[PDB]
């Protein structure tokens, strides 16, 4: 009885997706978005490391 | 003639300043220290200095130098000679130890052991230095002779040790490394016997032997500067570099 | 029948794979050409973190950005705190086989496990100034390879019996139990929003699932061997993941779709731990080749290397204010690099 | 400078380093072993999520762990010694077990650690092969073409048809030991009984030689 | 937790005597221990420390020379030797624990006391002797340093202490911001370099006292001079 196996692609199957190009442009924003915030990109001065 | 000698050393020298400098930094910093390891750096500490001596003779004999003083350039100069020619047997003692008693010396040992017997070793090398070549200003025409006694208990110390470890691994079990055991054990008490030991007699033995006292400066101990220049510069190689090599 | 069942199987798969390619328009390599590259990243070393005596297992940091928390198999763990290399706590366990840690959002407690099958909870700050356990939590039938606090009262555990859980910790109980795999599952990670979690197993296949219902909604299927390390993207709608087959791939959650590989010919070891920046611009990877590699995450080129160990790597992190990275290694010793 | 609560905070640091070097110390004269074997096999009764078992011989103390795989075996890397048991009566498993000691042999954590091999039960292998009810050839065809090597140590009291049955399967986890190894680790057979006093006599032999290779390949000597 | 003192008594000039405390209920060798005094009408007084591990003791310029601290780990006791007695000497004895690390809360806890009658420095000071309060209203204490007491690293190092009619002083506050265990709410403190304060709002019964500031850059140790709240 693999009942259980079909019942699950069912489920997973019929959801909403969208496109693909969607998908790079969103990561795209967020990276430029916040690209001034982290010293590992942007190095900072030595006055402000407290390594 | 003297100065082809003088070339023969500065050539011979130049080599063993560059590889006990590597041994000097890459054990120092770069990688960890084994029982043996520290043994291998204070007698690359002590061909430093040696080598160092030995270089600087040629940029002195360019104009003149004082006999009152000339002297206590020797006798300077053979306070790292002994050092360095006590630490091989301490060495070859280890290694006998290692295979001998193995589970001892891996679980049941004092990890500190190795730099005490090193200092122990500093103190006693200066000690019998200062007995050599008639520094005797402060009974002397019969001390003179006792630092002979410390060069052959070394050379029996040595020879001793390494036997014995080739006697156990002969006695054993389907040994298929044994090829690489007769060459360094043979290798290393030929350049001990033959290329270390003839300059450490000869401080000892010449006014005994004051047959000419002009004639032998020239010949006799400029090969003992050469050879002890020799074993000074192979050390490295035989005892570091093989192993980098290795794997 | 069961060859019934068995057929509507191959059409419902194969009607999957055709959801798939229609989404797929254009490519993220395509969209990201007209940007700049990033540059050359140079990092070194700040301070060495020694004191264990054996292999380093886990490490995880604190939410303050100052403290972390380290274990390895001579049976401690210990807390450091990053500015001064001063210890603060050293705690001895039961069983040396430990494989993972966790450290509470609050800083009250922390949680070990390994081959015990058992995930003990710590308290830090009590009267009597010591650290003593709290709770032990059974019933696993295999090791446990993570774990994660979800609140002061929640922790969620993964194992080598193919099952996640969720656990009450002043009960002791299991609240629900998440199944579906057929590997050993070796990492987890938490979204942002706390509401949903991945996880890689040895079946070569990734999960999400929802914490309140306890089903599983999606299935990624793209690499050829087995997943050891997983994150979330910062943005909470893509994560990453790091295989024996030598590669990191990236997977986006609203398209059910892989976006992005990174590979090179002359890499032919696993991955150990992947990590990402603050924005999502770096990713970072450990490797058993004795070191650890920075990818450009949006254009899938190498930028730097983190080279300073002689044993492989197994753990790596970095800061919730993004000023540090840290990593371990199978040498006993941890570095902190800026 | 370090203020007055920053230099009390250094002072405990001190301390607690001091109290994680007594603890390697103690730990550095224990040795740890790794017991693997599948079943039928009696490796509970040997010496005499994870079950531990302790034991002493000749003032060394020694620590052994079972677990009841190729997960979790990265964490046993670094081991003195790992002990497989095969039960050599039985003739329709022995494939199954050259399987297992093929993949233990041939796996990329494991490429420095040496394998003491026990196979046990031979007095019921005795009773098998006098009896005559069941063949060995019929299960390893080549059976017939062996024959006994010159080097027959053989203890006294046997019958020569039974040195010949146990010199063959001896031979068939001795060829995989020696067919790639690079000569960096070896594998060291024995014969049990499951009556046998002398084990841990023999544990404490083999883990003696281990060490002197380990010992003469750091000092460069190999 | 408990500590309890013994020994003290009536004494003659130029004598000597040995305090006892013997403490129950936690670990006592992570703790570090103080000795403070407290003359019979007057304020607080820092006398001598051990460490964890006595590795370091420091004594205060006024008994230097007389006195000595020692202590006995397997036995769970602390010891105070006296030498060479006079009558500045006559006060009341306290024994307290503190503990060093990162977030850490030093002068938790305060034992009862002991009496004993014989028959450069950071001064701070809190101008306000005594204030009349009434239930529900908001209060406020003010202390001042001498030197700043604003480290490099970000710390300012200030205590505040409350000391109830016939018993021993609790901590309030530690580091100038902090709220210690068991403290209700309505306490918070402020300032900054040289300049703070402690607020109490909703004032209640069971907070009237004496509060005391003490500063922790540096040896000696010093304390103010005190704040009676009446109803
Ligand atoms: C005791 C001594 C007496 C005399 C006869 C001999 C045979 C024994 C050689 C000796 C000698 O000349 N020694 C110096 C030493 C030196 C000079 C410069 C830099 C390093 C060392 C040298 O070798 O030129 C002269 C020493």
Redesign the pocket.
């Known amino acids: 009885q693999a009942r259980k196996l079909v019942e699950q692609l069912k489920m997973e199957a019929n959801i909403d997706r969208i496109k693909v190009s969607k998908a790079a442009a969103d990561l795209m924003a967020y990276c430029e978005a916040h690209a001034k915030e982290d010293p590992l990109l942007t190095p900072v001065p030595a006055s402000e490391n407290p390594f | 003639q003297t100065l082809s000698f003088t070339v023969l050393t500065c050539i011979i020298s130049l080599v063993g300043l560059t590889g006990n400098a590597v041994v000097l930094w890459l054990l120092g910093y770069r990688m960890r220290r084994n029982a043996v390891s520290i043994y291998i750096l204070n007698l690359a500490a002590a061909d430093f200095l040696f080598l160092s001596?030995?270089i600087?003779?040629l940029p002195?004999?360019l104009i003149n130098?004082s006999?009152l003083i000339?002297?206590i350039?020797?006798?300077v100069?053979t306070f790292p000679y002994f050092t360095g020619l006590s630490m091989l047997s301490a060495i070859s003692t280890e290694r006998c130890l290692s295979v001998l008693w193995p589970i001892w010396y891996r679980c049941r040992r004092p990890t500190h052991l190795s730099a005490v017997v090193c200092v122990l070793l500093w103190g006693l090398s200066l000690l019998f230095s200062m007995l050599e070549?008639?520094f005797c200003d402060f009974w002397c025409e019969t001390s003179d002779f006792i630092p002979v006694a410390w060069l052959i208990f070394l050379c029996v110390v040595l020879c001793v040790s390494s036997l014995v470890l080739l006697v156990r691994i002969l006695c054993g079990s389907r040994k298929m490394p044994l090829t690489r055991l007769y060459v360094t054990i043979l290798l290393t008490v030929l350049v001990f016997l033959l290329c270390g030991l003839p300059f450490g007699i000869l401080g000892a033995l010449?006014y005994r032997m004051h047959l000419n006292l002009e004639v032998?400066?020239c010949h006799?101990?400029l090969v003992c500067?050469s050879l002890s220049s020799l074993n000074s510069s192979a050390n490295p190689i035989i005892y570091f570099f093989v192993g980098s090599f290795r794997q | 029948e069961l060859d019934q069942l068995r057929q509507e199987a191959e059409q419902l798969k194969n009607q999957i794979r055709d959801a798939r390619k229609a989404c797929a328009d254009a490519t993220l390599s395509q969209i990201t050409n007209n940007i700049d590259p990033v540059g050359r990243i140079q990092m070194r070393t700040r301070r060495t973190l020694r004191g264990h005596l054996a292999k380093i297992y886990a490490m995880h940091w604190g939410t303050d950005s100052r403290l972390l928390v380290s274990a390895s198999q001579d049976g401690k763990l210990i807390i450091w705190d990053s500015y001064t290399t001063n210890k603060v706590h050293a705690i001895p366990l039961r069983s040396s086989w430990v494989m993972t840690c966790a450290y509470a959002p609050s800083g009250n407690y922390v949680a070990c496990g390994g081959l015990d099958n058992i995930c003990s909870i710590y308290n830090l700050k009590t009267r009597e100034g010591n650290v003593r356990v709290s709770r032990e939590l059974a019933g696993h039938t295999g090791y446990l390879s993570c774990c994660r606090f979800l609140d002061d009262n929640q922790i969620v555990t993964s194992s080598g019996d193919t099952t996640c859980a969720l656990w009450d910790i002043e009960t002791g109980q299991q609240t629900t139990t998440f199944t579906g795999h057929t590997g050993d599952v070796m990492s987890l990670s938490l979204a942002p929003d706390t509401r949903l979690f991945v996880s890689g197993a040895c079946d070569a296949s990734a999960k999400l699932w929802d914490v309140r219902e306890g089903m599983c909604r999606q299935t990624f299927t793209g690499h050829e061997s087995d997943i050891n390390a997983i994150c979330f993207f910062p943005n909470g709608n893509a994560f990453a993941t790091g295989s024996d087959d030598a590669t990191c791939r990236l997977f986006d959650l609203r398209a059910d779709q892989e976006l992005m590989t990174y590979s090179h010919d002359n890499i032919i070891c696993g991955i150990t731990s992947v990590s990402f920046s603050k924005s999502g611009r770096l990713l970072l990877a450990g490797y058993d080749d004795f070191n650890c590699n920075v990818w450009d995450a949006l254009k899938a080129d190498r930028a730097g290397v983190l080279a300073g160990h002689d044993n492989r790597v197994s753990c790596l992190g970095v800061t919730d204010d993004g000023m540090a990275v840290a990593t371990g290694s199978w040498d006993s010793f941890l570095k902190i690099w800026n | 400078t370090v203020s007055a609560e920053d230099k009390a905070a250094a002072e405990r640091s001190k301390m607690i380093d001091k109290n994680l070097r007594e603890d390697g110390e103690k730990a550095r004269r224990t040795l740890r072993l790794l017991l693997l074997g599948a079943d039928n096999s009696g490796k509970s009764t040997i010496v005499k999520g994870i079950f531990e078992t302790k034991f002493q011989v000749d003032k060394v103390n020694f620590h052994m762990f079972d677990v009841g795989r190729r997960k979790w075996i990265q964490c046993f890397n670094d081991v003195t010694a790992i002990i497989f048991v095969v039960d050599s009566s039985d003739y329709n498993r022995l494939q199954e077990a050259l399987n297992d000691f093929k993949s233990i042999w041939n796996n990329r954590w494991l490429r420095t650690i040496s394998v003491i091999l026990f196979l046990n039960k031979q007095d019921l292998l005795a009773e098998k092969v006098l009896a005559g009810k069941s063949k060995i050839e019929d299960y390893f065809p080549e059976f017939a073409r062996y024959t006994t090597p010159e080097d027959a140590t053989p203890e006294p009291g046997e019958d020569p048809r039974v040195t010949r049955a146990k010199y063959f399967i001896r031979k068939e986890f001795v060829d995989i030991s020696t067919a790639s190894g690079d000569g960096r680790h070896i594998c060291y057979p024995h014969f049990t009984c499951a009556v046998d006093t002398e084990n841990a006599r023999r544990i404490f032999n083999d883990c003696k030689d281990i060490i002197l290779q380990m010992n003469l390949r750091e000092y460069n000597l190999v | 937790v408990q500590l309890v003192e013994s020994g003290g008594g009536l004494v003659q000039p130029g004598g000597s005597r040995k305090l006892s405390c013997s403490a129950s209920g936690f670990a006592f060798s992570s703790f570090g221990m103080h000795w403070v005094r407290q003359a019979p009408e007057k304020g607080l007084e820092w006398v001598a420390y051990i460490s964890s591990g006595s590795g370091t003791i420091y004594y205060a310029d006024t008994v230097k020379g007389r006195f000595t601290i020692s202590r006995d780990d397997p036995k769970n006791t602390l010891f105070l030797q006296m030498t060479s007695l006079r009558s500045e000497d006559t006060a009341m004895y306290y024994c307290v624990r503190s503990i060093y690390y990162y977030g850490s809360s030093p002068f938790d806890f305060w034992g009862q006391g002991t009496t004993l009658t014989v028959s450069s420095d950071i001064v701070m000071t809190q101008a306000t002797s005594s204030v009349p309060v009434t239930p529900g209203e908001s209060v406020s204490i003010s202390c001042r340093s001498s030197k700043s007491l604003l480290h490099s690293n970000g710390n300012t190092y200030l205590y505040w202490f409350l000391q109830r009619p016939g018993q021993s002083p609790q901590l309030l506050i530690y580091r100038m911001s902090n709220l210690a265990s068991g403290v209700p709410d309505r306490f918070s403190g402020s300032g900054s370099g040289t300049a703070f304060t402690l607020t109490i709002s909703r004032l209640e019964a069971e907070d009237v006292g004496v509060y005391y500031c003490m500063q922790h850059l540096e040896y000696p140790l010093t304390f103010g001079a005190g704040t009676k709240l009446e109803l």
């Open positions: 001596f030995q600087i003779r002195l004999r130098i006999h000339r002297k350039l020797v006798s100069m070549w008639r010449i032998l400066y006799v101990y500067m």
